[PDB]
Amino acid sequence: GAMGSMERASLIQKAKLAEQAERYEDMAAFMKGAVEKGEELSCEERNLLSVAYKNVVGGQRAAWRVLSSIEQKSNEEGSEEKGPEVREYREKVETELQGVCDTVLGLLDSHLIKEAGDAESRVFYLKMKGDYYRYLAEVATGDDKKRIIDSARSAYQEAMDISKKEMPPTNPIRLGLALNFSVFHYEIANSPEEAISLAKTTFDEAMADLHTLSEDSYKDSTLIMQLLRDNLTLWT
């Protein structure tokens, strides 16, 4: 890798600088370099990794949705034939998105997940694994689509099982995992009832555990709780 000659601490420092500069591709490349040093990641370092790639793939997903919408309209009745360009360019963005998802899934598989033994790291990485298979599922159409969906489901489910055994209901990683697995159910798995049930049960169990927290932990948990409520309001 092109980051192989840079010190681990320097890669982490530069990832923070790139974040400040809103240079998320750079941020992600620095954090991939850091992962490839082979040492486990601290809590703060895991957060830099996830923020970097979430922003990169988030932009690709937004662009893919714009292009897919144009493509769909061009395939409606009465639409003037415009040639292959819309499909070609949607395919170009899709392939680049798939490449980023494969890169992240590769980092998790070599070797972040296998060395992650504490709940806060293992659940975090398995949530990421579910997230990036979910992004692959959003664009999947061929023979492999059901297997991609089940890979997302499997990763989310292992993360869910660990989080319920090992973390309090208000833990922000547990909450964000449930938020996203609920969206997986609604948007990917065609299971809106499961999505609603999960979001409601998660919210209610967190409500009942807020009394144990400091003010700073309370702020963190209620932030994601409001996203659960927002989704429930969208869905009901």
Binding site: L179, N180, Y186, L227, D230, N231, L234
Partner: peptide
């Protein structure tokens, strides 16, 4: 679209 983190 719904919220994810």
């Amino acid at each position: 679209f719904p919220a994810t983190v």
